[PDB]
Amino acid sequence: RELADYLCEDAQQLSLEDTFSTMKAFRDLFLRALKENKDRKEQAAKAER
Amino acid sequence: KLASADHFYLLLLAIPCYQLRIECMLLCEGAAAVLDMVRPKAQLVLAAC
Amino acid sequence: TTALVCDNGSGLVKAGFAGDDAPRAVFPSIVGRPRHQGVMVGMGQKDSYVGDEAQSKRGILTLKYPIEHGIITNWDDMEKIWHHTFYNELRVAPEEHPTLLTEAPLNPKANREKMTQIMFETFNVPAMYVAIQAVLSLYASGRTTGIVLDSGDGVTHNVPIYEGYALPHAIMRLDLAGRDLTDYLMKILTERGYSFVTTAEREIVRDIKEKLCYVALDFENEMATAASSSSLEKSYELPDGQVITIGNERFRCPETLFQPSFIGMESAGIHETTYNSIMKCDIDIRKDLYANNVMSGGTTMYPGIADRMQKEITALAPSTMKIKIIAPPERKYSVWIGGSILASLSTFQQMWITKQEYDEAGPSIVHRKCF
Amino acid sequence: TTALVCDNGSGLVKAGFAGDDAPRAVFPSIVGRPRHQGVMVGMGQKDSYVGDEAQSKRGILTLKYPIEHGIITNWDDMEKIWHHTFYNELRVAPEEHPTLLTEAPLNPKANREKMTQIMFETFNVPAMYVAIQAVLSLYASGRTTGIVLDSGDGVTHNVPIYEGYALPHAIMRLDLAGRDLTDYLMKILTERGYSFVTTAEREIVRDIKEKLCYVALDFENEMATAASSSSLEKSYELPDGQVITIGNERFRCPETLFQPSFIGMESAGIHETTYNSIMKCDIDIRKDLYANNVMSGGTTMYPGIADRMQKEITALAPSTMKIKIIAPPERKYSVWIGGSILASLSTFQQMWITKQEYDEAGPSIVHRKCF
Ligand SMILES: Nc1ncnc2c1ncn2[C@@H]1O[C@H](COP(=O)(O)OP(=O)(O)O)[C@@H](O)[C@H]1O
Ligand SMILES: Nc1ncnc2c1ncn2[C@@H]1O[C@H](COP(=O)(O)OP(=O)(O)O)[C@@H](O)[C@H]1O
Ligand SMILES: [Mg+2]
Ligand SMILES: [Mg+2]
Q: Least CA distance to C321: which residue of chain B?
A: B37
Cβ atoms of residues D92 and D86 within 8 Å:
yes
Tell me how far apart the terminal alpha carbons of chain C are, to the nearest angstrom: 25
Which residue in C199, C135, C197, C66 sits closest to C337, CA to CA? C135
Q: Which helix (H) or strand (E) holds C371?
A: none
Contact C359 A47 (CB under 8 A): yes
| Dihedral over alpha carbons B35, B36, B42, B47 (to 10 degrees) | 140
Tell me the CA distances in angstroms from D207 to D143, D167, D202, D212, D225, one per residue in order: 33, 36, 8, 8, 25
The residue whose C-alpha atom lies closest to atom 8 belonging to ligand 2 is: D298
Distance in angstroms (rounded) separating the CA atoms of residues D68 and C58: 53
Q: Nearest by CB to C322, which of B3, B37, B41? A: B37
Residues 6+ apart with CB under 8 A from C190: none
DSSP-derived secondary structure for B1-49: ---HHHHHHHHHHTSTTHHHHHHHHHHHHHHHHHHHHHHHHHHHHHHH-
Rounded to 5 degrees, what angle do the CA atoms D115, D120, D123 make? 90
From chain D, pick out residues whose CB is under 8 angstroms from the CB of C110: 193
Indicate if the alpha-carbon torsion angle D283, D287, D290, D294 is positive or negative.
negative
- Of all ligands present, the nearest one to the C-alpha of D65 is 2
- How many CB atoms within 10 Å of residue C355? 13
Q: Identify the helix (H) or strand (E) that includes residue D268.
A: none
CA separation for the pair D325, D309 (Å, rounded): 8
Concatenating the DSSP letter of every residue in D274-301 gives HHHHHHTS-TTTHHHHHT-EEEESGGG-
E strand or H helix at A11, and its extent? none
What's the CA gap between D172 and D166, in Å, rounded? Answer: 12
User: Cα D108–D111–D113 angle (5° rounding)?
Assistant: 115
* Rg of the Cα atoms in chain B: 20
Residues 6+ apart with CB under 8 A from D308: D215, D216, D217, D258
Evaluate whether D274 touches D308 at the Cβ level (below 8 Å). no
Measured distance CA(D11)–CA(C362) in Å, rounded: 44
Which amino acid, residue A18? D
**Count of C-beta atoms within a 10 Å radius of residue D67:** 23
Can you name the residues that pair with D243 across neighbouring β-strands?
D237
How is chain A split among helix, strand and coil, in percent rounded to 5?
Answer: 75, 0, 25
Q: 3-class DSSP state for residue C9?
A: coil
Assess contact for C334 and C136: CB atoms under 8 A.
yes
DSSP state of D353: B
* Residue D69 CA: distances (Å) to CA of A23, C318, D153, D176, D371: 48, 23, 8, 9, 21
Separation CA D343–CA D330 (nearest Å): 19
User: Which uninterrupted H or E stretch holds C273?
Assistant: helix C270-279
Phi, psi of D234 (to 5 degrees): -135, 140
CA D228 to mean position of chain CA atoms: 36
Burial (0-12, 13-18, 19+ Cβ within 10 Å), C329:
exposed
Q: Which of C141, C165, C152 is nearest to C292 (CA)?
A: C141
DSSP state of C319: T
| Interface membership of C356 toward A (CB under 8 Å) | no
User: Do the bridges between strand D71-72 and strand C61-64 make them parallel or antiparallel, or are there none, so unpaired?
Assistant: unpaired
| Atom of ligand 2 lying closest to residue D133 CA | 23
DSSP one-letter string for C225-265: HHHH-TTS-EEEE-TTS-EEEESTHHHHSTHHHH-GGGGT-
Q: C172: which strand partners?
A: C158
HSE, CB side, 13 Å, CA atoms: give it for residue C208: 32
d(CA C361, nearest CA chain A) in Å? 9
The HSE-up count of residue D173 (CA atoms within 13 Å, CB side) is 15
Query: What contacts C41, CB < 8 A, 6 or more positions away?
Result: none
CA dihedral C327, C333, C335, C339 (to 10 degrees): -120
Spatial separation of the C-alpha atoms in residues D49 and D31, rounded to whole Å: 6
Position in ligand 2 atom list of the atom nearest CA D28: 22
The sign of the CA dihedral A18, A19, A25, A29 is positive
CA atoms within 13 A on the CB side of D352: 20
Of the CA atoms within 13 Å of residue D242, those in its CB half-sphere come to 6
DSSP D130-176: EEEHHHHHHHHTT-SSEEEEEE-SS-EEEEEEETTEE-STT-EEE--
Q: List, as ranges, residues with CB under 5 A of the ion ligand 3.
A: C 9, 152
CB C210 near ligand 1, within 6 Å: yes
**Percent helix, percent strand, percent coil in chain C, to nearest 5:** 40, 20, 40
Give the atom of ligand 2 at the shortest distance from the alpha carbon of D29.
Answer: 22
d(CA C307, CA C323): 11
| Alpha-carbon gap, residue C184 to C114, rounded angstroms | 32
| Contact assessment for residue D89 and residue D25, using Cβ atoms and an 8 Å cutoff | yes
Does B touch D (3+ CB pairs < 8 Å)?
no
- Residue C171 sits at the vertex; the CA angle it makes with D157 and C368, to the nearest 5 degrees, is 95
Cα–Cα distance for residue pair C346/C367, rounded to 1 Å: 24
DSSP bridge pairs for D85: none
Dist CA C190 CA D31 (whole Å): 37
* Residue D49 phi, psi dihedral angles, 5° rounding: -85, 135
Q: Is the CB of D206 under 6 A from ligand 2?
A: yes
Q: Determine contact: A47 vs chain C, CB below 8 A.
A: yes
CB D148 within 8 A of CB D159: yes
The b/e string for A4-42 (b: 16+ C-beta within 10 A; e otherwise) is beeeeeeeeeebeeeeeeeeeeeeeeeeeeeeeeeeeee
Question: Mutating which of C69, C73, C106 best tests the D interface, going by the most D Cβ atoms within 10 A?
Answer: C106
DSSP alpha helices (H): ranges in chain D?
Answer: 52-56, 76-83, 109-117, 133-140, 178-189, 199-212, 219-228, 249-252, 270-279, 286-290, 305-316, 334-343, 355-361, 365-369
CB C63 within 8 A of CB C202: yes
C-alpha R_g of chain D:
21
The dihedral sign for the CA sequence C266, C270, C271, C277: positive
User: Could you say which DSSP state residue D177 is in?
Assistant: S
Nearest CA in chain C to B39: C320
Residue C320 carries which side chain, given as an amino acid letter? T
Which domains does chain C possess? 1-27+70-134+334-370 (3.30.420.40), 28-69 (2.30.36.70), 135-181+271-333 (3.30.420.40), 182-270 (3.90.640.10)
Residue D312 in contact with residue D272, Cβ under 8 Å?
no
Which B positions 1-49 lie with beta carbon below 8 A of chain C? Answer: 3, 33, 37, 41
Q: What is the 3-state secondary structure (H, E, C) of C128-183?
A: EEEEEHHHHHHHHCCCCCEEEEEECCCCEEEEEEECCEECCCCCEEECCCHHHHHH
- What's the CA gap between D181 and D210, in Å, rounded? 11
**Integer angstrom CA distances of residue D280 from A5, D158, D274:** 46, 11, 10
Measured in degrees and rounded to the nearest 5, phi and psi for residue D98 equal -65, 150
Contact status, residue C14 vs residue C23, Cβ threshold 8 Å? yes
CA separation for the pair C23, C15 (Å, rounded): 6
For residue C245, what are the β-bridge partners? C235
Cβ proximity of D222 and D304 under 8 Å: no
Dist. CA B28–CA B45, nearest whole Å: 25
φ, ψ dihedrals at C15, nearest 5°? -115, 155
Q: What does the radius of gyration of chain A's CA atoms come to, in whole angstroms?
A: 18
Chain D from 140 to 199: CB within 8 A of any C CB:
187, 190-193, 195, 197-199
Half-sphere exposure of C53 (CA within 13 A, CB side): 15
Rounded to the nearest angstrom, the distance between the alpha carbon of B11 and the centre of ligand 2 is 65
Residue D170 exposed, middle or buried by CB count within 10 Å (0-12, 13-18, 19+): buried
What is the DSSP secondary structure assignment for residue C283, as one 8-state letter? S
What count of other Cβ atoms lies within 10 Å of the Cβ of residue D354? Answer: 14
Look at phi and psi of residue D142 and say left if phi exceeds 0, alpha if psi is from -120 to 50, else beta. left
CB D185 within 8 A of CB D205: yes
Name which of C320, C321, C331 is nearest C290 in CA terms: C321
d(CA C228, CA C246): 14
User: Is residue D8 within 8 Å of D107, Cβ to Cβ?
Assistant: no
Q: How far apart are CA D253 and CA C354, in angstroms?
A: 34
C202-209: long-range pairs with CB below 8 Å, 24+: C202/C63, C203/C55, C203/C58, C203/C63, C204/C238, C204/C239, C206/C178, C206/C182, C208/C236, C208/C244, C208/C246, C209/C178, C209/C181, C209/C182, C209/C185, C209/C253
Q: Is C359 on the interface with A (CB under 8 A)?
A: yes
Please give the helix or strand (H or E) that residue C336 lies within, else none: helix C334-343
Are C179 and C170 spatial neighbours (Cβ–Cβ below 8 Å)? no
Q: Which residues are D326's β-sheet partners?
A: D294
Q: Do C266 and D35 touch (CB under 8 A)?
A: yes
Shortest-distance Cα residue to atom 8 of ligand 1: C298
Rounded to an integer, what distance in angstroms lies between the CA atom of residue D134 and that of residue D371?
12
Comparing C-alpha atoms, which of C244, C242, C176, C187 is closest to residue C212?
A: C244
Q: Are C49 and C32 in contact (CB under 8 A)?
A: yes
